[PDB]
Amino acid sequence: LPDSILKRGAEASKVLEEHLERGNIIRIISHNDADGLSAAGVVARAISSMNGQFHISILSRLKKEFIKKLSGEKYSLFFFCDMGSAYLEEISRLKGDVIVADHHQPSESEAGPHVVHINPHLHGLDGSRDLSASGTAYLATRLLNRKTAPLALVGALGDMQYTDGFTGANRFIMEEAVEEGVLQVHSDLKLASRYTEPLYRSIAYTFNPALPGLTGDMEASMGFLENIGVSYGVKYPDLSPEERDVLRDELTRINPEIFGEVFTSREFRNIGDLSDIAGVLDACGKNRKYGIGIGLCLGEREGALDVALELQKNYREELVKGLAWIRREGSTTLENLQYIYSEDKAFKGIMGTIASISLSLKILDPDIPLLGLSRMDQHVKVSARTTRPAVERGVNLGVALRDAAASFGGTGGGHDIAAGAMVPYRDMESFLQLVDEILGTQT
Amino acid sequence: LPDSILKRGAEASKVLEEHLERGNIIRIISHNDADGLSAAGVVARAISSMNGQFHISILSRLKKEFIKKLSGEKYSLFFFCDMGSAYLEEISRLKGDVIVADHHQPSESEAGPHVVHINPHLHGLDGSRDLSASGTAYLATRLLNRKTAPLALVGALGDMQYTDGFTGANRFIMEEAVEEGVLQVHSDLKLASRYTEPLYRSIAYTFNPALPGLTGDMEASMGFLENIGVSYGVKYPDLSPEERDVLRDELTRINPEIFGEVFTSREFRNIGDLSDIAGVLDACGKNRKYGIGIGLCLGEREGALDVALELQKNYREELVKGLAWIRREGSTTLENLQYIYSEDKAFKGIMGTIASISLSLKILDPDIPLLGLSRMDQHVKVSARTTRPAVERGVNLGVALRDAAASFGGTGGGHDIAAGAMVPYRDMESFLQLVDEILGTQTG
Ligand SMILES: [Mn+2]
Ligand SMILES: [Mn+2]
Ligand SMILES: [Mn+2]
Ligand SMILES: [Mn+2]
Secondary structure, eight states: OOTHHHHHHHHHHHHHHHHHHTTOOEEEEEOSSHHHHHHHHHHHHHHHHTTOOEEEEEOSSOOHHHHHHHHSSOOSEEEEESOOGGGHHHHHTSSSEEEEEOOSSOOOSOOOTTEEEEOGGGGTOOTTTTOOHHHHHHHHHTTTOSTTHHHHHHHHHHTTOOSSSOOHHHHHHHHHHHHTTSOEEEEEEOOTTTTTSBHHHHHHTOTTTTOTTTTTOHHHHHHHHHHTTOOSSSBGGGSOHHHHHHHHHHHHHHOGGGEEEEEEOGGGTTTOOHHHHHHHHHHHHHTTOHHHHHHHHHTOOSHHHHHHHHHHHHHHHHHHHHHHHHHHSOOEEOSSOEEEEEOOHHHHTTHHHHHHHHHHHTSSOTTSOEEEEEEETTEEEEEEEOOHHHHHTTOOHHHHHHHHHHHTTOEEEEOSSEEEEEEEGGGHHHHHHHHHHHHHHHO | OOHHHHHHHHHHHHHHHHHHHTTOOEEEEEOSSHHHHHHHHHHHHHHHHTTOOEEEEEOSSOOHHHHHHHHSSOOSEEEEESOOGGGHHHHHTSSSEEEEEOOSOOOOOOOOTTEEEEOGGGGTOOTTTTOOHHHHHHHHHTTTOSTTHHHHHHHHHHTTOOSSSOOHHHHHHHHHHHHTTSOEEEEEEOOTTTTTSBHHHHHHTOTTTTOTTTTTOHHHHHHHHHHTTOOSSSBGGGSOHHHHHHHHHHHHHHOGGGEEEEEEOGGGTTTOOHHHHHHHHHHHHHTOOHHHHHHHHHTOOSHHHHHHHHHHHHHHHHHHHHHHHHHHSOOEEOSSOEEEEEOOSTTTTTHHHHHHHHHHHTSSOTTSOEEEEEEETTEEEEEEEOOHHHHHHTOOHHHHHHHHHHTTTOEEEEOSSEEEEEEEGGGHHHHHHHHHHHHHHHHO
16 A cells, blocks of 8 residues: 555554553544444444443534534544544544544545544545545554454445455455455355345345346346246255356356455354445444444344344345336436435435445446435435446546535535435425536536 | 522421321322332321321322322322422312422422422422432421431432532532431442342442443353452452452442442441432332332331342342343434334333433443333333433433423423423324424534
């Protein structure tokens, strides 16, 4: 990588150690998706391993008001994951030391001198591809605990940073984790929950890498498996070798991606591969069941796990319906983006995910950035997704949504390839065109 | 301390004396938790000490109907503890004199020259911190009996009014109880039932001050004690001095609050410290078993005590399960609150207690107000708890739940730090979503 970062990391480990040695409790603030929860987990696990204590809050968006509420509180160290780069001035106004582990672009003023800021953008690395919050937290805790590297990669997968191989600092973290013996790599089919789910359901629930015709369609996948003569009520490992080969052959025909690298760790045995864990965390996060998510990251797997797996199941079911909806009513295309709108509470939480999946499946034109829109009474939650070719063409959704949302007194941001915003429902049209214009621009 | 409240207290003592001298039986109505039972005990002890007679009814909630049923009955004096401030008009409609000893925000109405109302809120004091029903009853009976001060503090502890030291009128009552020689203060570890329970169980049952990792977990605490090399099957006082020192060192590392002030009285020797007594009463109250709680308060300790300690054991066991349940199914967080929902009767009676303990332990984020929810066929019972930093930030659960509930034809109220409500199942989501905003305006 560029050895610079590792250094910045170490600065942050030093600070962390200082405060732990003094007995003071560490305040952790993070985001509510796979990356945010796995980042919070990395840090809390590092603290735990030093017989230290931590206080975690999970937020869906960091707000100026919330930062002020903290500036009260008698905590000596604040650790921010997956947010904060946009509020560096405001955060600097905290009494007490601060670490910010984040991977969004600038944001933007200077960052005070009692604050440690780790961000791939600052070290010549791409925050959209080469590192996520969870990995940034690992670099911050790497000299204290290396057992956490699998979780670091959970967040990276969660944030869609696997682009045929891990790249940049994610590659570094993978390599290390192998070297430390806590991560194994296998070539295999990338099917959903292969250890806990019968083949027909596993195929239907393989949303990424997507399998057009089969993904999201229990009937068609059951059918498909009969047509090719492969048992559809057994779990993948309980198949015969011959059946495995025929299956590998026929699914690859539908999408070559389906076969490739698969990541496992003794830590997550009986649950899933690393991508599966990312899914379980997304389901916990979408259900504001943050405790279950973090418990899972720290190693709780008894009642918590049952609950977590049940939440996934529901999550998956909701995704199937959402995909069916998009197939039924289409999207309206403009000139530089397309969009999809729904007042159904069923889809509020999952709009971004079904957006992404629908582009992969090519239900919708993957060349055109897709804005999913869900009403929250007076406001509308926006979830924008596109693809890596579109980012190459110059698309930056994080920028477009931030600028546009501000214009109407809203709040928005993200990365080039995925972003979100919140705006008055009343301003939806105006909003949408403005993004349109902003779009065609950078393009 | 305001002279006004001591004076108001004396007015109530005078009234009580008047009726006792006339030989009439005194009607005592109180609540069913530690504070409610200890308050009822204070009054009945003062009555007993004057060779007088009393009739006690314990209620889980005072209702308009019930007040009317009393408005019959041939009793000359009615003594309300831990309730009544919300029903002052309805109460004044009683024929016969009335004392109301309470500490809920009363906004508001008008008494009726014929009702004596003692409440810290009326005298510039905080009902959430500076005085509870039991202390308010003590101020009402203070010029007739001072041996009751320990019980007054039992209710205060029960109502979670120890905030690093007693404050306000509770501090006054403590100081007076020392001066009278009925209360002693020690620095020591604040472990559950140290005189009657082996160390591993004592640590597992120390719910407050909470000990993360150990509290509620028999296996872990047994383990912990082996790990540090301290006898785990012996009672705290039967340990060696060296063992005591090592233990004091290793528990303080987990929570500094575990060592600090401890309150005792010859009255409760062989049973527990004052916080232990609060626990026994909560157990009696949660099981009904009101006659036993009150027996304990009056000094009955033979068969009654055995029964009481058996009940505590069961209560504590239920709390352990409830905590485990929260650990298993988590809470869903929203903007300004979190909540937990159950269909079990195992947890009905204890929802609010395990809510409080889980926040102390930080199973759940203590910065965020926690709403426990249990279904009653058509309605759902709500138990809300939060912490003192949150109340500082501006949270008031009593208010939030009262308003919100009403807005759906429900009924709700309490204090800033703890409250309850009852609403139609048919619209939880609306209810929850309305409280989550009322709190944003509170903390904004
Ligand atoms: Mn995130
Ligand atoms: Mn992220
Ligand atoms: Mn009470
Ligand atoms: Mn009370």
